[PDB]
Amino acid sequence: STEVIAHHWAFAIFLIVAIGLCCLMLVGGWFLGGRARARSKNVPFRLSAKFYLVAMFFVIFDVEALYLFAWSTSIRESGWVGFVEAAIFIFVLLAGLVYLVRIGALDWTP
Amino acid sequence: MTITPQNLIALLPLLIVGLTVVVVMLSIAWRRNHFLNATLSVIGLNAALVSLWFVGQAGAMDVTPLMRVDGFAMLYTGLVLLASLATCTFAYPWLEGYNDNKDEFYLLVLIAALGGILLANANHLASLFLGIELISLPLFGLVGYAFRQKRSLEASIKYTILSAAASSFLLFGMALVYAQSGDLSFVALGKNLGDGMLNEPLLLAGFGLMIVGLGFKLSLVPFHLWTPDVYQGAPAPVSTFLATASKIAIFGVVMRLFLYAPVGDSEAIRVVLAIIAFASIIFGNLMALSQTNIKRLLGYSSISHLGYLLVALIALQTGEMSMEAVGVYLAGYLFSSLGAFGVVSLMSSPYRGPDADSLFSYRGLFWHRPILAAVMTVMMLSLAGIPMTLGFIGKFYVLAVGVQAHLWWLVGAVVVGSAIGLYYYLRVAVSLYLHAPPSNWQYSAGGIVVLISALLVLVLGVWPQPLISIVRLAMPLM
Amino acid sequence: MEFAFYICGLIAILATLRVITHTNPVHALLYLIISLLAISGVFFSLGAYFAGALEIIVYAGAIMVLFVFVVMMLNLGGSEIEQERQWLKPQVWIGPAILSAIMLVVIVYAILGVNDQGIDGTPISAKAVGITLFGPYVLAVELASMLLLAGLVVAFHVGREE
Amino acid sequence: MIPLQHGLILAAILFVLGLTGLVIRRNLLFMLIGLEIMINASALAFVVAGSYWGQTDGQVMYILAISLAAAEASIGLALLLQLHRRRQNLNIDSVSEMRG
Amino acid sequence: LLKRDPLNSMMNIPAVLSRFAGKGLLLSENGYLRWYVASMSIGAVVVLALLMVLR
Ligand SMILES: CCCCCCCCCCCCCCCCCC(=O)OC[C@H](COP(=O)(O)OCCN)OC(=O)CCCCCCCCCCCCCCCCC
């Protein structure tokens, strides 16, 4: 089919021209305009474990999200049995979320 | 394949342990209650152990392509559940001295027991991989539960790094096997070959990488060096669980994989496993000769005992009673390791800091803890394969299986390793009676567990026929 | 279709080689992200569309975000181990390089003797993967939820501040 | 028209590169990075094998593999943070007090 | 000449061999994680080479 190969060429040209466009604006910004020196121009103008905890929770729940992504595109042909399986999955998810909230894992404020 | 109500009846201990995980986690979310959450965990494990009766009444059947439930799966599920119940029982008096959160321990033990049940029922490379991971990751948490201690943190780091490496090795081997075979079911691994072309190079290489991962998990030489450090650094109930349940479940799924796969009777794999079993027996016995730490000594002992079990694995296709020998040996090894590690756990309870694992701390144990010393000397006699112990019955089964299949190098290795084991086990058991310079019902429950283990070891050492008949009843699908 | 496969494979190999030899951790993670993008391109060239989408969504969009997050939290600057460049000394890496080369040679020799009709690259959709996941692989899905729950509990117990 | 051997060889190359990085790096973060490389390579090998046979099982094993990779990366980075808290140093040779 | 029981020492030789072999094998347990990983990869190489030799 020539339609799919035309769309592949269009997608490739889209990505190439977008990347080259931002590269070209960066190059033009670097090249144009005069430069001046100052004494204090070069002068610039421990994080808690909650940061790692939030990122880790995001990673784990994103993996369970991928499982639900796979389920959601084929719900009709998985039937009510697949609904029961995904309901068990989501219940385990919500129980984990309730556990995380209730023990203060998702409480930034003291 | 779909899931039917009778398949759900065959699913019963897995469903009960999962429901226990959810219930205990929601109870922790309600309120942190050590007694209540420990009680809920042991109630769920006991319920799964009881529901094994309904599983047996249901019969042997395939639940999805992933699992097959039979008497073999029931026996290994029962062994895993017994080890988990003992681990919780030893965990409570140890966790009574823990200043941080104690309720997560039982959650991790329950999830690891779920992985053990999955490995008991596994009929597929997917379920084997998932069961191994489901055992290992809660053990990453449990080994480093007292992560403020440097030994527990170091053991957790070592176990996590090496188990991730072994899991990647096992998954790469599974992928190579799948690339050769085109099916991840156990019975299809080598089925698409004929006319004496079983030794396909990619299939053998994939099975070798799986051997790397599984032999890490079973502490088999040369994937064994983690064992004394992780055994010593872990908390003592965690050491109990890691010595019993993880090893038993992984060896059971290895048993089933080598029974069902047509490439399991390949001569190259048999010779490689013979070399591994020989080296495991000799090395694990030799390294435990001069151990002043009881947990490290039990780690090297575990290496040697898994070598004996692998010797029984090698004669799977040659002889007729290899699976029966493995079942009898694993029951005896579970009871002996439960007693020994439980005495260590009760001597380290409550948690105060460094573990009581020096042999000088167990020197003269009889003069203040006589029952614990009697239990520990019974377990040292059992792990040495001394008669009127179940360990001797297991060793006799291993020797009979090796003699039937004419594995004379392995038989001689078992004899030599038994002599070396005699030296160091007798050293521990007689140091118990030399001269050297609690008060709640959960500690009494742990003492009752180790006493019952000692009584079972002695009684089934004298009279092994009930255990033999039970193991002969628990047979897989041929 | 094979043009993309070979170029993405070469890019992934080169980026991984830059990863395991680099000094700056953020730069090493950036090369790792590049290698994961190339591996996703490999997945898309083989027809495994869901695998490539998850390779960028989850591997190159969640897990390495966590690695980058931890590195940025630790403020890894002029570390003494970082400054030494011990892994760049021949006497440190020449042994493991020979060991990995021997393992690669053995695995490649095993690979070259397998039956190969070629990969047609017919797209196996996310819909078929979802059908398989909630059909024959239902127990895998539920016990994977349990596995990630175990990871969550362990990482909360260990990575707390207190 | 992609040979299965070429995809398997690419996966093996990535696997041994990750193993080399795991062995030669004293810093625990680069050890975890090498572990991520090896598990990603094994998952790639499963995807290649599934694509050769025209089956969803390769991508299902990929999904299980990356679930393991995510949870293991979470645990390993928690342990790395604990090591940095209690040691102020990520040298893995320092965690060696248990031996013999 | 015999008062030291030479046959007893000749039969005690395997005990000193076991002691020496155990002391030599305990050198591998140096406590280093990177060596444990390297030994796992060495064992992988040995297992794979043995399987390809006896295929
Ligand atoms: C405080 C609360 C305490 C609660 C109690 C806790 C402790 C007690 C736990 C009890 C657990 C009972 C488990 C019972 C399993 C067997 C049930 C059964 O009826 O099995 C029969 C069945 C074969 O017989 P049939 O019914 O004819 O088979 C039809 C199916 N084709 O048999 C089979 O199919 C296989 C039979 C063998 C399966 C293994 C046995 C169960 C697990 C044992 C683990 C320990 C073994 C070692 C120790 C033995 C000590 C004697």
Ligand SMILES: CCCCCCCCCCCCCCCCCC(=O)OC[C@H](COP(=O)(O)OCCN)OC(=O)CCCCCCCCCCCCCCCCC
């Ligand atoms: C140019 C020379 C090199 C320059 C330096 C490197 C630049 C990047 C090179 C890699 C990315 C582009 C590779 C070339 C893709 C060209 C399109 C293509 O091959 O399309 C064929 C096929 C279309 O799909 P299908 O329906 O199967 O069609 C088969 C024919 N009917 O396509 C497919 O099936 C899959 C299409 C490719 C996969 C998606 C894109 C992946 C991009 C990954 C980038 C990784 C990071 C790169 C970093 C570079 C700098 C270090």
Ligand SMILES: CCCCCCCCCCCCCCCCCCCC
């Ligand atoms: C401070 C301690 C550091 C320990 C570093 C350990 C590095 C191990 C390197 C092993 C190199 C092996 C080289 C090949 C050996 C021959 C082939 C395999 C065995 C047959």
Ligand SMILES: CCCCCCCCCCCCCC
């Ligand atoms: C350390 C253990 C040594 C055991 C030696 C056993 C030797 C067996 C030889 C069998 C020869 C069979 C010829 C057909």
